[PDB]
Design a protein around this ligand. Sequence first.
Ligand SMILES: COC(=O)C[C@@H]1N=C(c2cccc3[nH]ccc23)c2cc(OC)ccc2-n2c(C)nnc21
Length: 108
Amino acid sequence: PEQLKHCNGILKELLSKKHAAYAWPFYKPVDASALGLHDYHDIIKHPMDLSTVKRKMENRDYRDAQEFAADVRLMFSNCYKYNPPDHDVVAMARKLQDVFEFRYAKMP
Ligand SMILES: COC(=O)C[C@@H]1N=C(c2cccc3[nH]ccc23)c2cc(OC)ccc2-n2c(C)nnc21
């Protein structure tokens, strides 16, 4: 359960201001209506975002660090799945995932 404590620090890091230039699209769930996407939920069956991870973090919904990392990676996979690789939101996702993978790897 000490490793869940480190996951909270990783989540705080992703939500911090130093990464805001490429983390802001993942703060909240994809609002398909507001963005004009007519097919997002037919392609993405399990939406995920940083605020959902924070909510499940606070409600003790992650049994271990690997369940936490599975949700963070699901959020990036949804982005890679829905968007073409040339798209800009994908480039932001890769930067933020590179931050996450670095912090998750440095975990005891
Ligand atoms: C217009 O929406 C899209 O084409 C997809 C969308 N792009 C983006 C997006 C994010 C940043 C630069 C962008 N340029 C074109 C699309 C795009 C997006 C924007 C948001 O604003 C609150 C929230 C979520 C996303 N997002 C995520 C996450 N995964 N795909 C997207």
